[PDB]
Structure 1
Amino acid sequence: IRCIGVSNRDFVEGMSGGTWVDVVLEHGGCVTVMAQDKPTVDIELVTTTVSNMAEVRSYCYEASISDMASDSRCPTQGEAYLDKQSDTQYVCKRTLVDRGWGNGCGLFGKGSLVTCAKFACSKKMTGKSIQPENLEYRIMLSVHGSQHSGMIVNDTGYETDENRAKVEVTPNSPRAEATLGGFGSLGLDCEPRTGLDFSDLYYLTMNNKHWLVHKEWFHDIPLPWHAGADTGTPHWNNKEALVEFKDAHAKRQTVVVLGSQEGAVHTALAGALEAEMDGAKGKLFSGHLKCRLKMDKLRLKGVSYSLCTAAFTFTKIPAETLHGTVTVEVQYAGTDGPCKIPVQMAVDMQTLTPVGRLITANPVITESTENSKMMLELDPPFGDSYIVIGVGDKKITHHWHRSGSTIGKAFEATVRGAKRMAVLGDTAWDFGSVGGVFNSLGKGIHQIFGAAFKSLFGGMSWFSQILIGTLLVWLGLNTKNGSISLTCLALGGVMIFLSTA
């Protein structure tokens, strides 16, 4: 439920004796945390809301010049001067023009010419700063249990459902607990400060389109900027980055403004996360949290129930959810009340030996009317097998064939882990970890390599990474020495880092 159709779901199984497990919730990726004896809960980070942002600059990407004037002095008579030259709204430029007896002067030579022109800006983009005491991650939870198909993305009603509960995690209140009625309460000891590193991100805003630009990039744009939250007539430092003074040859100097740089900066971002805004708060939809799941009071509701009698019936013939797991929906015809579904999977039906585990732990029927639907999820074995749902002779069966192999499983999981390590980087060592001398020492070594790599290369794009990766792999296949593994690991860390995007 809530995570059964997602194409980027990860299963985190196993804890430290039932205490807790670390997870890294990403935007767009779901996490299914199945424990030993506890209900399977689905955790998903939905939004990241940045609030109370204060602006720093405002670049002017489309200007216009009003009345322009000029003044000229004869040669060897000083240099020109306009009254509107001491005005900080006029962009001016002085140059030397040829001056002679025909131009009304009295001496041949290079004169002097000053051209003023009023700078008035029409459109501008504001960049607001993000402080990490403003992030507020929202986490939606969902337990596998008394829920049918109409419970997966159906968000209409959670706090009256016993199965769905949202949790808002702020760096002011990092640990929050979700109340799942009957199942207990899952505890989340989040890390809402070490998220997407909002100490070097801004919030661009250009014509009702907001981005998440880097601070260094935002401080290097060559456009006329002013100091802050000015809504009146700003000062516009660096006006000369949009006007262009052209002298033809003679006593003439034309001033023309460059057009609207909106498109020129749209194609200049090309790496920035697109965000949105719902008023004063900026709602991001990309990033990641780092969460620890205290699962000690998540209890299994319905372990003392009685089995079902009979009359199960398949509705919505089972399906395969991109990972092998099977989503079965049943319909118990009976009035037993809160009973327990006797589901299992079996090779040849004589012995009924169980062969596959069950993703939804302890399925249970709670609705006591005669037609009570319920949705399971199994994890079949590789090869053909049967899905037995019931006891006695009125049990229903369904032939299932899970195409694949354990070697394919292992390679798929390795590719998954490599992508997670290329995306998250250092925090990828805290995804299923329970603590140790490997998932805590390897993280240190990976952190050292990550700092020494993001500070060394740290500034190349996809194409340049491919280029220097080929160069380094060729320096590895030649120049036989001890510094060859060094120029081949720096081929891997540059091809898989990009070339898995």
Structure 2
Amino acid sequence: IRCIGVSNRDFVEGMSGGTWVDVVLEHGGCVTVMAQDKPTVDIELVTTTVSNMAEVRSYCYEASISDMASDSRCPTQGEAYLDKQSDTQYVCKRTLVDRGWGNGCGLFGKGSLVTCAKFACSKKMTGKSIQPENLEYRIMLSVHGSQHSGMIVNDTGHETDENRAKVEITPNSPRAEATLGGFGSLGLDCEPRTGLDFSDLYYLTMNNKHWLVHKEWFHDIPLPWHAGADTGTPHWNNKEALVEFKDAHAKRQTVVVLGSQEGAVHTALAGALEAEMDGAKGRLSSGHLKCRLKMDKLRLKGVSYSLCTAAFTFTKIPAETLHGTVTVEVQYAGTDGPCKVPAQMAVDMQTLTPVGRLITANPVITESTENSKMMLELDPPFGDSYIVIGVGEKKITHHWHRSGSTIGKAFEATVRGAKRMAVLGDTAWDFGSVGGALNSLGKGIHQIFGAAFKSLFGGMSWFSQILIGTLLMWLGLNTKNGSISLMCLALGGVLIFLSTAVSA
């Protein structure tokens, strides 16, 4: 449920005894945890929301000029004053201009004048700030079993219902026991800080279009500043790059405005992530986090339930996911009550030889009603399959044949783990989460090493990191004393793998 056909999902287990399943919660995929007990659970990060943003310096990219002024002065009488310049609403620059005979100025030679004009502007760039507090995570999770066609469509009553739950997380209130009447308590405690490395992030809204920007880049943009300001005529700062002054070969200086650079800041925005409904409530797309998840109290609701002997029937052609598993929605009337129902698979029967991954443990049916649809899934082994459902003779079976080999499973798992290794960096650790020694060792080694990788190879671009990896390779063959040339090979391969990022 809720995590099928959402590829980039994962399945994580926990070696039973001391529920310690710290998942790397994803705002761009789902994660399903399983346990021999403790009905299998999913978690998917719906949205990310920020409550309060502060109004740091704004920017203007659309300006307008008027009431120009030159204020010529003789080659020797000082240089131009132009009382206009007195005001800051005007932008002015002072230029040495030629002044000859038949030009006034009984002398002649290089004189000077100060060309300038009013700086009126429009289309401000509200570059607000946000901080790791009064931001807000909002997730929804779903246990399997009941709830034919889970399917967020009618989520409203599903958080009121038992199979789905909606959770809000604050850096003030990190804990949340996702309580499911009859199912469990789903203990959760997360790190609402180290998700997106906030406090270096600004919420820019330009043309009612919002996004997040690494505040360093936002500080480095050379447009006019509102600079902190509030109401009152905006005294724009630096006021110069926008307008452009130009004299003739020697004389008569004028000014151009260079219009609006809206699309220019767009093409300069080539790394930000866009963001939506903003109100006093600013929502944004993906951003990960670390969530210690505990199966403290999850009762499976019907381990004692009988296996009512009605004949079961498929409805939809149980296609499989990229993760190899396969979901089926099986309907049946014929019996009543809160039923437990069998679901196994085999290679031969007259054995039924229950084999393979059972994901949707304790599949439960609610009521006496007609052919309830009983959505669930299982995962077959690498060969042909025989998924068996009903009970015995009036059961229903079906071929599968996963067609995914065991070494192939390791392939998909390791390339997935490697992509995690890349994008989550340190956080890719404790993903399969037991508090084991080598786990904290990996966390720490990546901590120091990748932090150095940041501070040394600061924000290496696509092309940059590409050629850096290439020349590191070329050098990894050249140098003697493999000790360091192997380190060249290592960093170069790290760079190239970083260039194998999601971009493909």
TM-score interval (norm. to shorter): over 0.9
Cα contact 2:79–2:112 (8 A) shared by 1: yes
SS in 1 for 2:350: coil
TM-superposed CA distance for 1:270, in Å, is: 0.4
Q: TM-score, normalised by structure 2?
A: 0.96
Equivalent-residue separation in structure 2 for 1:229 and 1:281 (angstroms) = 22
2:129 touches 2:203 (CA, 8 Å); kept in 1? yes
Structure 2 CA distance for partners of 1:16 and 1:199, relative to 1, 3 Å: farther
8 Å contact kept, 1:307–1:341: yes
Q: Counterparts of 1:201 and 1:348 in 2: how far apart (Å)?
A: 58
Hey, what does 1:183 align to over in structure 2? Answer: 183
- Matches of 1:129 and 1:497, distance apart in 2: 33
Provide the rounded CA distance (Å) in 2 between the counterparts of 1:486 and 1:341. Answer: 57
Change in Cα spacing, 1:329 to 1:167, as seen in structure 2 (3 Å) is same
Aligned residue in 2 for 1:151? 151
2:308 maps to 1:311? no
Work out whether residues 80 and 112 of structure 1, in 8 Å CA contact, stay in contact via their aligned partners in 2.
yes
Paired with 1:104 and 1:141, the residues of 2 have a C-alpha distance of 83
Secondary structure of the 1:438 match is: helix
Q: Distance in 2 between matches of 1:489 and 1:331?
A: 57
Q: Distance in 2 between matches of 1:251 and 1:476?
A: 61
Whole-angstrom CA distance in 2 between matches of 1:72 and 1:244 = 19
Deviation at 1:324, TM superposition (A): 1.5
Q: Deviations over 1:168-223 (max 9, x none)?
A: 01010000111212101101011111111111110111111111111110011011
1:248 aligns with 2:248: yes
Contact 1:79/1:112 (8 A) holds in 2? yes
Going from structure 1 to structure 2, the CA distance change for 1:294 and 1:497 (only over 3 Å counts) comes to: same
1:312–1:330: 8 Å Cα contact kept in structure 2? yes
Shift of residue 310, structure 1, vs aligned partner? 2.6
Partner of 1:453: 453
Q: 1:496 to 1:44 in 2, by over 3 A?
A: farther
Listed one character per residue, the Cα deviations across residues 229-263 of structure 1 (whole Å, up to 9, x for unaligned) are 42442110101111111111233111111121111
The separation in 2 between residues aligned to 1:439 and 1:489, in whole angstroms, is 25
Is contact 1:2–1:153 with CA below 8 Å preserved after alignment? Answer: no
Going from structure 1 to structure 2, the CA distance change for 1:447 and 1:49 (only over 3 Å counts) comes to: same
Inter-partner Cα distance in structure 1 for 2:196 and 2:5: 26
Query: Could you tell me whether the CA contact under 8 Å between 1:209 and 1:276 is conserved in 2?
Result: yes
CA contact (8 A) 1:186 1:295 kept: yes
Greater mean alpha carbon deviation, residues 249-258 or residues 486-495: 486-495
Residues 150 and 11 (structure 1), Cα distance of their counterparts in 2 relative to 1, 3 Å cut: closer
Say if 1:318 and 1:328, in contact at 8 Å, map to a contact too. Answer: yes
Task: Give the 3 Å change call, closer, same or farther, for CA 292–162 of structure 1 in structure 2.
Answer: same
Residues 14, 433 of structure 2: 8 Å contact kept: no
Q: Aligned to 2:106, what secondary structure does the other structure show? A: coil
1:497 CA displacement: 4.4
- The structural deviation recorded for 1:360 is 0.4
Q: 1:18 to 1:332 in 2, by over 3 A?
A: farther
Cα offset, 1:350, TM superposition? 2.4
Cα distance in 1 for partners of 2:11, 2:98 equals 79
CA contact (8 A) 1:337 1:365 kept: yes
CA RMSD of aligned residues (A): 1.5
> Does the 8 A contact of 2:30 with 2:42 survive in 1?
yes
Contact 1:14 1:36 in 2 (8 A): no
Query: In 2, distance between residues paired with 1:415 and 1:489?
Result: 20
CA distance in structure 1 between the aligned counterparts of 2:331 and 2:243, rounded to whole angstroms: 73
Instruction: Give the Å deviation of 1:344.
Output: 0.9
**Counterpart secondary structure, 1:439:** helix
**Whole-angstrom CA distance in 1 between matches of 2:183 and 2:325:** 23
**Stretch moving more, 414-423 or 365-374:** 365-374
Partner Cα separation in structure 2 for residue 373 and residue 149 of structure 1: 8
Take 1:489 and 1:435, find their aligned partners in 2: how far apart are those partners?
Answer: 32
Give the Cα separation in 2 of the matches to 1:318 and 1:141.
Answer: 23
Greater percentage in strand: 1
Instruction: Confirm or deny: 8 A CA contact 1:9 1:31 kept in the other structure.
Output: yes
Cα offset, 1:277, TM superposition: 2.4
Contact 1:62 1:123 in 2 (8 A): yes
CA distance in 1, matches of 2:58, 2:493: 38
Cα deviations across residues 92-118 of structure 1 (Å, max 9, x unaligned)?
122222222211221121111111211
Could you list the per-position Cα deviations for residues 85-143 of structure 1 after superposition, in whole angstroms to 9, with x for gaps in the alignment?
A: 11111111222222222112211211111112110111121111111112210110100
Please state if 1:128 is matched with 2:128. yes
**What is the rounded CA distance, in whole Å, between the counterparts of 2:497 and 2:201 in structure 1?**
22
Deviations 1:406-434 (A, max 9, x none): 11100110000000010000011111111
CA shift at 1:17, angstroms? 1.0
Residue deviations 1:135-162, cap 9 Å, x none? 2101101000112125455423123311
Offset of residue 336 of structure 1: 3.1
Deviation at 1:3, TM superposition (A): 0.6
Distance 1:387 1:109 in 2: 98
Higher mean C-alpha deviation, range 96-105 or range 174-183: 96-105
**Counterparts of 1:229 and 1:76, CA distance in 2:** 41
Kept after mapping to 2: 8 A contact 1:125/1:206? yes
CA shift at 1:76, angstroms?
1.5
Kindly state the Cα deviation for residue 61 of structure 1 after the two structures are TM-superposed. Answer: 0.7
Counterpart of 1:371 in 2: which secondary structure? coil
What's the offset of the Cα at 1:483?
4.4
| Separation in structure 2 between the aligned mates of residue 486 and residue 456 of structure 1, nearest angstrom | 19
Please say if residues 48 and 137 of structure 1, whose CA atoms lie closer than 8 Å, have aligned partners that are also in contact. Answer: yes
For 1:490 and 1:455, how far apart are their aligned partners in 2?
18
Contact map agreement 1:15 1:21 (CA 8 A) in 2: no
**Offset, 1:492:** 4.5
Question: Structure 2: where are the runs of 5+ without partners?
Answer: none
Q: CA deviation at 1:24?
A: 0.6
Counterparts in 2 of 1:483 and 1:63: CA distance versus 1, 3 Å: farther
Aligned with 1:114: secondary structure? strand
Q: Separation in 2 of the partners of 1:272 and 1:38?
A: 41
Aligned to 1:264: 264
Judging changes above 3 Å, is the alpha-carbon distance between structure 1 residues 447 and 491 closer, same or farther for their aligned structure 2 residues?
Answer: same
- Would you say the 8 A contact 2:179–2:185 is kept in 1? yes
Q: Which residue of 1 aligns with 2:402?
A: 402
Equivalent pair of 1:465/1:494 in contact (CA under 8 Å): no
State the percentage of identical aligned residues: 98
